[model samples]
Target: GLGPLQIWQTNFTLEPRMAPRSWLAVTVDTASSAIVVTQHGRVTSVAAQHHWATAIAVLGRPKAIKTDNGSCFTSKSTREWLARWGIAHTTGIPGNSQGQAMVERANRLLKDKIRVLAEGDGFMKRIPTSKQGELLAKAMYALNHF
Candidate 1:
């Protein structure tokens, strides 16, 4: 069994054809599946780096992070930031399934839980970032309990 904070898998996801143009940044433990987190809104490379800053301060740092190496992750500042934190930035072929499997799967799992929570709240298609943050908390909380 791998120890905590060894490796992290990060990815993005959104509701299909949804009205809200929100982006969710999610990072999951590559091995333990013990930690999962979410940050909402339309995220860019810098915003993701900022998100990483807060999360790392809270949970400590990972040895490395796995991502798609495209879009936001490809930013120079993002790489520099991770390196500064003593975390290696690793990536695979863009748009490849196997590369980002862990985080992507976790993202899928979370959206399922989040959707259920959203449903319970009588939410519909036009969800916004602020409200999504609330649902995100519950979803991440519920999944982390496992």
Candidate 2:
């Protein structure tokens, strides 16, 4: 094993009526990254933010944090909170697709491997994205414990 689990921040959106129609943005340990997918569920921006923090809290304080240059996470509040917690925040190399390819690969793998299992037999034609603070808790618990 390399060092401790490397923390990564990312979110996923499924095609409408496709998956739990929910977007699950997750913060995962790079060494143990995985997504247990379910269909027709949606996770929104605000909820994703809260869930991200919750995931970190459950993982205890991470030694560091890394994310792509997404405006949503670069807000003053998030930076301030991370600063207070003394977690080093780093950004992935922009336009260097390969540098960020790991998560993309993981996403595709999950879609191929876990999303269907998560969906079960449900056939949803479409699921519009919705605000997801509450729904995120489910994914958080599933990911942490699963």
Candidate 3:
């Protein structure tokens, strides 16, 4: 059986209907089903590296990472970043979410939970990205708890 951080599953989900579109970036431990790290806002190759840095700094680096084949995740900068960190990076195949199934499910469940919380708090009317960022953390805390 795999150990925690043996292979971190990483992905991004765009917040729908955002006037200033925001992306929720998440990394989950494949073996433990623990959410390793999260970042909310725009995404770029540099930002992707920074996101991984947060996880690596706190939870230590994963032996390998499985990420979607987005340009940022596959970019030269991201490649250099992973290589420099000595963490192997694997990209899920095109047109296939199954390869990233764990993180995909995590993203969906996390997003739905955030929305539910927002509605209950009446932030669903016009929640700013910053406000939603707070909600993301709150929802994550709830889910990551046993």
Candidate 4:
């Protein structure tokens, strides 16, 4: 239930994309010191908003959600959505990187793995759009096993 005990932290980063766009938004979860879910979107509040729904569908409703002051997570609609779901929300201290250390660590590790896997030949090309999720799954699997 979306009470006041469980805490879930989330954050996102941008990655270069194929010809259709410049970059893709990849969101990460900080649940129990590891990423419980990851989703890619078009770098918009709506996309991020939907990604949270998907994550909740899979991971179940969290009591509270912690994130940075990104518009996607801090917007009024998003706040209402969280309220409707009976979930609490919190944002890290502004300008404090350590405030989001857990998610940042996972983001760094995941992106590093993606970069390594996406560029086997080291030519510096964007990862194929279709393979982005697949690679993310692979990264998550490896991290979980590690």
Top candidate (lDDT): 3
Q: How accurate is candidate 2 locally (lDDT)?
A: 0.52
In order of appearance, the predictions have TM-scores of 0.82, 0.60, 0.84, 0.77
Q: Assess the local accuracy of residue 126 in candidate 2 as a C-alpha lDDT between 0 and 100.
A: 32
The lDDT of each candidate is 0.71, 0.52, 0.75, 0.65
User: Tens digit of lDDT per residue, candidate 1, span 78-115?
Assistant: 87777788888888875356657767777778878877
What's model 2's lDDT at 83? 79
Worst 10 residues of 3 by lDDT: 15-24
Candidate 4 global lDDT? 0.65
Stretches of candidate 3 off by over 4 Å are: 1-5, 17-21, 94-98
Candidate 4 Cα errors over 4 Å, as ranges: 1-5, 17-31, 36-41, 94-98, 121-124
Worst lDDT run of 10 residues, candidate 2, spans 123-132
In terms of TM-score, how similar is model 2 to the real structure? 0.60
Residues 86-122, candidate 3: write the lDDT tens digits.
9998787743565587888887788778778888877
Which has the higher TM-score value, candidate number 1 or candidate number 3? Answer: 3
lDDT of 4 by residue, 1-146 (tens): 65334567676665563324433333344444546544543556676677678777756788778887888788898888889899888888642464476666766787677678767745367766677667767877777677
**Candidate 2 structure quality by residue, lDDT tens digits, 1-146:** 65656565454445333444445454546656643233334443345456556666655566666666666557776677777778787776542353356556645654443344335534233323352323434544555466
Residue 18 of model 4, lDDT score? 35
